[PDB]
Amino acid sequence: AVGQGERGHFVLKSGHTIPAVGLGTWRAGSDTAHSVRTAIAEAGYRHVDTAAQYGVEKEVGRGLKAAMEGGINRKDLFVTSKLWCTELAPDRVRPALEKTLKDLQLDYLDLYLIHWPFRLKDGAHMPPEAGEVLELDMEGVWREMEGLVKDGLVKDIGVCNYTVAKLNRLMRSANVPPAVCQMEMHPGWKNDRIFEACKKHGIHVTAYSPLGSSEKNLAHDPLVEKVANKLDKTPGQVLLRWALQRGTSVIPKSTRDERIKENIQVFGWEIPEEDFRALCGIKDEKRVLTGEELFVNKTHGPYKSATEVWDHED
Numbered sequence: 001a002v003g004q005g006e007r008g009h010f011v012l013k014s015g016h017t018i019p020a021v022g023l024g025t026w027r028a029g030s031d032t033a034h035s036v037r038t039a040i041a042e043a044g045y046r047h048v049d050t051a052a053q054y055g056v057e058k059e060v061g062r063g064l065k066a067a068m069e070g071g072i073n074r075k076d077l078f079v080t081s082k083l084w085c086t087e088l089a090p091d092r093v094r095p096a097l098e099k100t101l102k103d104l105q106l107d108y109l110d111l112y113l114i115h116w117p118f119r120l121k122d123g124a125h126m127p128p129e130a131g132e133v134l135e136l137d138m139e140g141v142w143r144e145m146e147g148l149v150k151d152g153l154v155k156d157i158g159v160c161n162y163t164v165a166k167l168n169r170l171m172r173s174a175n176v177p178p179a180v181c182q183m184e185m186h187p188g189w190k191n192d193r194i195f196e197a198c199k200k201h202g203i204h205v206t207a208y209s210p211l212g213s214s215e216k217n218l219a220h221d222p223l224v225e226k227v228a229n230k231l232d233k234t235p236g237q238v239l240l241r242w243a244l245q246r247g248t249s250v251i252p253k254s255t256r257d258e259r260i261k262e263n264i265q266v267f268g269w270e271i272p273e274e275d276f277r278a279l280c281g282i283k284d285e286k287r288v289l290t291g292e293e294l295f296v297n298k299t300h301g302p303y304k305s306a307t308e309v310w311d312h313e314d
């Protein structure tokens with residue numbers, strides 16, 4: 001699905017549109033403001049993805065402000081933030097959003113996501129010590145997030161890093177189902193299982209770490225590079241276009257102006273079926289972001305391995 005032009009977009013269940021390409025901001029650092037302004041004003045991005053836990057929201061805010069002061073309406077932008085683990089209790093949801101909106105210098109978010117489906121204690125360590133991973137009242141948290149929508153502070157709500165079982169648990173109790181499920185997706189980790197479950201429920205999927213992140217960057221993968229040279233495009237452009245053809249929005253992160261400009265030029269051309277199949281053919285070995293260092297305590301639990309974080313669905 002698409003919108004057409006570099007204004008390509010997907011449609012959420014609420015009728016609101018999400019631009020197909022967004023700017024990621026994890027580890028964007030003290031360049032964040034510049035990258036956000038450049039991406040929006042010069043490269044024509046209309047979607048920014050951030051989070052409180054990234055520590056860059058104030059910077060994103062200054063960037064968004066500068067971009068809008070140059071004659072772009074707030075309505076045209078799509079801003080996503082995320083509710084962190086330590087704030088996953090009903091009475092912490094609203095204060096967390098207000099802080100995010102204040103740092104971003106906004107009055108509403110377009111999308112507010114559960115960052116991870118795990119509650120952490122205040123002052124939790126990495127890895128977490130005994131009793132620092134707490135019990136999650138998912139139903140109560142989600143009810144409060146529905147209230148944010150009702151008040152108009154958030155236009156849509158959703159989740160990240162979910163399993164099929166956790167999705168079913170949420171879908172049982174929810175009045176407003178999740179608009180978006182944001183997941184690690186790239187060649188080498190398709191996660192078709194979660195994608196199919198989201199497709200069934202009409203939930204839109206955003207591919208995070210679409211280039212394999214910093215840790216396992218795929219821009220010098222032999223197969224990706226072969227396709228890139230064949231089509232006269234960059235490896236990044238191929239990786240991102242591959243995702244759009246699967247039907248997921250993408251949020252590639254870069255702090256370099258030229259890469260920011262490149263990453264959105266993924267419309268008006270396609271990856272042929274043979275090349276698409278070859279990239280899908282890369283085996284799903286391992287994920288870059290396991291959540292092990294955030295939630296796994298091997299000795300005391302309650303989560304003693306990475307497979308327990310993903311409900312044994314790998």
Ligand SMILES: NC(=O)c1ccc[n+]([C@@H]2O[C@H](COP(=O)([O-])OP(=O)(O)OC[C@H]3O[C@@H](n4cnc5c(N)ncnc54)[C@H](OP(=O)(O)O)[C@@H]3O)[C@@H](O)[C@H]2O)c1
Pocket residue numbers: 023024025026027049050115160161182183207208209210211212213214217219234235236237251252253254255256259260262263289
């Ligand atoms: N929900 C979650 O839990 C979650 C988890 C991970 C990520 N995310 C979100 O998704 C966004 C993207 O994921 P990610 O930041 O992990 O990684 P990514 O976008 O897959 O990869 C970014 C890395 O590739 C480089 N890069 C960017 N464009 C390139 C190109 N055209 N050619 C070659 N290299 C390129 C970047 O370096 P330079 O910056 O130096 O250009 C950076 O090192 C994050 O910023 C965040 O918004 C969410």
